Structures are given as C-alpha cells and as structure tokens.
C-alpha cells in the first residue's frame, strides 16, 4: 500500500529525494 504507492511512483519515472 505504501509499497504500491512507491511502485506507482517508480513505474512513472517520479524522482525520489536523496
């Protein structure tokens, strides 16, 4: 769920910080 949120970000090339 948090895992799914993170994965949605990565599948969409969102830049994570640090």
């Amino acid at each position, epitope marked *: 769920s948090k895992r*799914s949120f*993170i994965e949605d970000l990565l*599948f969409n090339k969102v830049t994570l910080a640090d």
Partner: antibody
Framework: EVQLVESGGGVVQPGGSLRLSCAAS????????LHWVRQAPGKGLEWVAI????????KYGVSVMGRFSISRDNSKSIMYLEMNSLRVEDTGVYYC???????????????????????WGQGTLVTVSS | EIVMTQSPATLSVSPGERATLSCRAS??????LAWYQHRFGQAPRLLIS???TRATGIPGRFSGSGSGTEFTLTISSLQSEDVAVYYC??????????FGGGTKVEIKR
C-alpha cells in the same frame, strides 16, 4: 525449495498466439514482482515484461509492446505471458524470474540497492515458424 | 533508457587465475547492479546484487565492486565450470531493468 516451472512453449505459425505459464512454489508468490526474459538464438538475454506483486503495474519491452500481455493469478501462484501476433524473431527460450526489488519492504522499507532476479525458471522453447 | 555496456566481449583466463569483467552504465545506477552467470544449457544464475553482495550459496571467489556507472565482477581461481556468459543488469531505473550484452568467459590454453 523456491521453484519456478514454465510450460506452454511450442510451435506456432507467424501471426499466431501462445500462452506461457510460470507455476511457482516454495515462497509467498504474492510478495514478488515477476518478469519474463528471453534469449533468441545467438543473442543475449532480452527483458520482455514485468508485473508488480499485486498485478497493478505492468511494463513491456519495446519489441513486444502491444502484442504481449502479462498477468498473474495471486491465488494459485501462477504467472502468464499471453503472446499475440507472433513473429519469427520472437523465437527463443523464455524464462520467468523472481525479482527481489522491494520484496523486503514490510521488514526493511524502501532500499533501492536490494534487487536482482534471484530465481529463474528452466526456460521454455518458443518456435515461431510456418 | 539506461544502456549497459560490458567488456571485453570474450575473456580468456588461465585455469586458477583471476577473471576481471567490466560493466558500464550510460548514467548513474548508484549500486543497483546485479551480475548473472549463464552456463550453456542452463537457466541464468544470480551471482551478485547491490553491486557487491554475494547471493546465497555463491562462493567467495566471486566478488563485485563499483558504484555510479563503472562496475567490476572478479572471479578468482577460475575453474572450467565457470565457463559461461556473464551479464550485468541495472535496476537503478527499476522497473525498467536492462541487461548488458554479455561477456563470454573461456579457459585460456
């Protein structure tokens, strides 16, 4: 103890369709992204597709996009690759693989250094030919 | 998207000597890098993930190092069972993972 058993390879005519299966055992199937990887004669490993642990996200190699469809049954622990409009150049050995990425999330959170395909199927031969 | 480039294409190493394989990423992958052994007629086998963490059951004569865009796999005391094609794979860009083109390791005679 972790095991991935592939099935469904065979001969198909150009333009035809084929469904590959990857039956998993010995681990919590629902905790892992899984991929398909293939090898054409004389060529290196080529990534085909990924499906996320809860089946919500999917991506495809540029060579197969729009023709292949990846899915998973998270109650019988089986992954599928549906291949439509097959081309002669789709010929090769097809492997399923278990991805470690984010699989330890519940215990250790987000660690993008953890990854790799730690278990692979035995491979199934797909022959596209008239 | 991220292109992985392995060298040399073929590596010839004397029995019992050390094989050094190189992998370059076209942009930084931090240490999100894995190495695989692919023996002829078998399924690929994970050797290293996280650039330098040996996978379970992998002997200590296999090791890796590097971060950013340059990586190395070292195989000490090369044995004929090590003859295989070796692939690197980045997952810094996960889920868009990508493989190197492979390095063939052979016994020199």
């Amino acid at each position: 103890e972790v095991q991935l058993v592939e099935s469904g390879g065979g001969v198909v005519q150009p333009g035809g369709s084929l469904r590959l299966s990857c039956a998993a055992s010995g681990f919590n199937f629902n905790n892992y992204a899984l991929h398909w990887v293939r090898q054409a004669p004389g060529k290196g490993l080529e990534w085909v597709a990924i499906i996320s642990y809860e089946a919500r996200n999917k991506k495809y190699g540029v060579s197969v996009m729009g023709r292949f469809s990846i899915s998973r049954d998270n109650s019988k622990s089986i992954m599928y690759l549906e291949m439509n409009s097959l081309r002669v150049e789709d010929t090769g050995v097809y492997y399923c693989a278990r991805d470690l990425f984010l699989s330890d999330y519940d215990r250790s959170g987000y660690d993008p250094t953890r990854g790799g395909f730690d278990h692979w199927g035995q491979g199934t031969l797909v022959t596209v030919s008239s | 998207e991220i292109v992985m480039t392995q060298s040399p294409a073929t590596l010839s190493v004397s029995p019992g000597e050390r094989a050094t394989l190189s992998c370059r990423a076209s942009q930084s992958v931090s240490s999100s890098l894995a190495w695989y052994q692919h023996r002829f007629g078998q399924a690929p086998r994970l050797l290293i993930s996280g650039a330098s963490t040996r996978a379970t059951g992998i002997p200590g004569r296999f090791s890796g190092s590097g971060s950013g865009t340059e990586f190395t796999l070292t195989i000490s005391s090369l044995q004929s069972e090590d003859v295989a094609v070796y692939y690197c794979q980045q997952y810094g860009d996960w889920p868009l993972v990508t493989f190197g083109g492979g390095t063939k390791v052979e016994i020199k005679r």
